[PDB]
């Protein structure tokens, strides 16, 4: 045959050394040498990499200089192309429909960051219940008076998560782990809203109580956990109507996608006292954090580290290489497909 | 006749109003109206409050005008005193042995903050596996480039706690809640080191594996959880020798007391890169936090907020009031004695 040709966007592997060596056994890996989005579309128009059968993206932050993967750039891929495999769950940067129209199969890396992301979210919930963020800022002043004033100030407002209600917006895979840790580890109760209902087992295992609308979920919650896929339909899913329905002095955390929560609404609900504290690992104008949120006492903000753990990367690398391996050499279907499903070689 | 007499040290109840009503009700509650220490010694000499049978202290910061509770002060108490129940875990301000020399039973508020303090440690554990503290500071620059560079920089070292080893120094009530949360919550593994063994029912539940020395525990640990009482025995317990025996790139969290861990041995270990990260709620020179620790990217620091939750203080009041009711009206022993245990009355 003998060696199908894989285009690699950005870096080679950093963790699964043996598996990456076997992968290079097995396929001719062509480095993309990315410069500009435009430079890469020029490259594709000039047949610079030749015909190639697969594209591999080994990390979320790898290959970004090729973005966006819109119709226009996709119109230039060689027709030999069979499969594109990418790290990550989100593929906001990718027109999956333009890619499927060319008979190209897509695979993401769904599942790899579950443990990671659910942990960060557990960290956020801890943080907004105990006001730990404000606490750390005080400690880091290195000032004796501040340390004491704050240690006392926090005591008027901090609460154990235990017996308080976590309102899950979405009850997908990462929210199931989040829940299980809040319910069984921290002792919170669960109500959730979701497009579809959890099975008998998940509900009876987490004590999940479903409700019909977001407003209902808001009404019932002491802290809300947003964990939904991001799309047009989820943009500003969390807005003014939602904060108006929440209880005075409640809490919210986001590990899903920034613009799923209206930053302006959020800011307004903290200023008014509707929310006591909020925790964001994602930001509507990412990489720009809200200057107003920072400026506030009780808002925990992190640099999108939800899935950022070495084990997650181990899995991004495993799954991308395994998918291509399966789909081109083994005649097996993709392990983590997304969009239209094609036949293996 | 009915109603034993209780001296109230400082302010009345602030959270459990209805319990405080029934208490008051059951007992003649006499406010100390404290002025100063000597002032309280003199009220006691003059018999200002008459005989009483209990003292109740409802918040850690109440009645501090009476400190110290030294032998000279204790020696003027009415011979009718049988019990003193207090808010707090610590009692540095009290000479316990002297109180006991006078047949007075003592009770603190052990366990009141088991939920609070275990949760705060779990938080810190999350913080030192994931370098979240670093990430927080990075976010608050509000500089887009910092955001991305730190996003990427954390990826070089952050790890799931899942499958890694939590080494419990001390396995009392707080650690057991920490292990529980770390083990079945996070999927961590647990080895421990404690002057007392823990029973089948516990070790089987937490999958707990006991070792015999600090040096051992340091070697088997991916993350060290320090949670021991602070005394003579435990001063500087975690020292240069301990950090010497710890796996390269390991981590440590303290929720116990400041000096249980040598601040200088800690700084060194962090500087050598023997430690990746560490999380301190309590500080050697509290309330002064290490200014070296502060400048380090990978050190999480909080203002002693372990037990600082509204529920903890709800429970200080529950226990102090319930302790005196059992001991004096229900013929039952204290729930949380500390020091010599004495027989009740009804
Ligand atoms: N913080 C991070 O670094 C990080 C990392 C990875 C993923 N995430 C986020 O997690 C979120 C999704 O969770 P997942 O992918 O782990 O599990 P999943 O794929 O199973 O999530 C989808 C779940 O949400 C429900 N859902 C689908 N569409 C919805 C909508 N329109 N409105 C409300 N609910 C809907 C579905 O029933 C399903 O249960 C995504 O937003 C994703 O971007 C965050
Ligand atoms: N950060 C906070 O706000 C805060 C709040 C509550 C408790 N604490 C701390 O928790 C610690 C006590 O833990 P606890 O409340 O679970 O009480 P505990 O008595 O149950 O904990 C002590 C445990 O350690 C063991 N032990 C005692 N001395 C030891 C030693 N010298 N070496 C090794 N093991 C020893 C005991 O068997 C016991 O199991 C104290 O330092 C206390 O200050 C801090």
UniProtKB/TrEMBL annotation, chain A:
Occurrences of domain D-isomer specific 2-hydroxyacid dehydrogenase catalytic (ranges): 52-331
SUPFAM superfamilies membership: Formate/glycerate dehydrogenase catalytic domain-like, NAD(P)-binding Rossmann-fold domains
Iron as UniProt keyword: no
Domain D-isomer specific 2-hydroxyacid dehydrogenase NAD-binding stretches: 124-306
UniProt cross-references to Pfam families, sorted A to Z: 2-Hacid_dh, 2-Hacid_dh_C
Binding site residues for NAD(+): 173-174, 194, 228, 255-256, 281, 307
Cited PANTHER family: 2-HYDROXYACID DEHYDROGENASE-RELATED (PTHR10996), D-ISOMER SPECIFIC 2-HYDROXYACID DEHYDROGENASE NAD-BINDING DOMAIN-CONTAINING PROTEIN-RELATED (PTHR10996:SF281)
Stated family: Belongs to the D-isomer specific 2-hydroxyacid dehydrogenase family.
Record's protein name: D-mandelate dehydrogenase
Organism, scientific name: Rhodotorula graminis
Gene from which the chain derives: dmdh
